[PDB]
């Protein structure tokens, strides 16, 4: 079956920094574009971040930009959302998914990152 498993959350200081993995198994990973999407509280889920094959972004969020790099890496078949200045409205589950035209979609069940005063430095 594929799988699409996000790890790398957790809590974090305003100012910091996460990555996140995404580690797949059970389908042609290097075939795939690849997104990284996130449900923050009281909105809308929302785009970060989408890859082409070979590595290269296509997209980020306004709300990200400058901050937050996609990567992947095709020899463990492994996607990465490395995050930068976080701030607490980057307090959200992130997804990673592979979507396409006339193809099945497919989302991870998401880790957790809270942007926290609290957290542990
Ligand atoms: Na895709």
């Known amino acids: 079956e594929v799988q699409l498993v996000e790890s790398g959350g957790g809590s974090v200081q305003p100012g910091g920094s996460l990555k996140l993995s995404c580690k797949t198994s059970?389908?042609?990973?290097?075939?795939?574009?690849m997104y990284w999407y996130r449900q923050a509280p009281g909105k809308e889920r929302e785009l970060v971040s989408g890859?082409?094959?070979?590595?290269?972004?296509?997209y980020y969020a306004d709300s990200v930009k400058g901050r937050f790099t996609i990567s992947r890496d095709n020899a463990k078949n492994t996607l990465y959302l490395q995050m930068n200045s976080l701030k607490p409205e980057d307090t959200a589950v992130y997804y990673c998914?592979?979507?396409?035209?006339?193809?099945?979609?497919?989302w991870g069940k998401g880790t957790q990152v809270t942007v926290s005063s609290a957290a542990g430095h």
């Open positions: 998914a592979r979507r396409d035209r006339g193809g099945m979609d497919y």
């Open positions: 890859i082409n094959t070979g590595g290269g972004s296509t």
């Open positions: 059970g389908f042609t990973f290097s075939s795939y574009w």
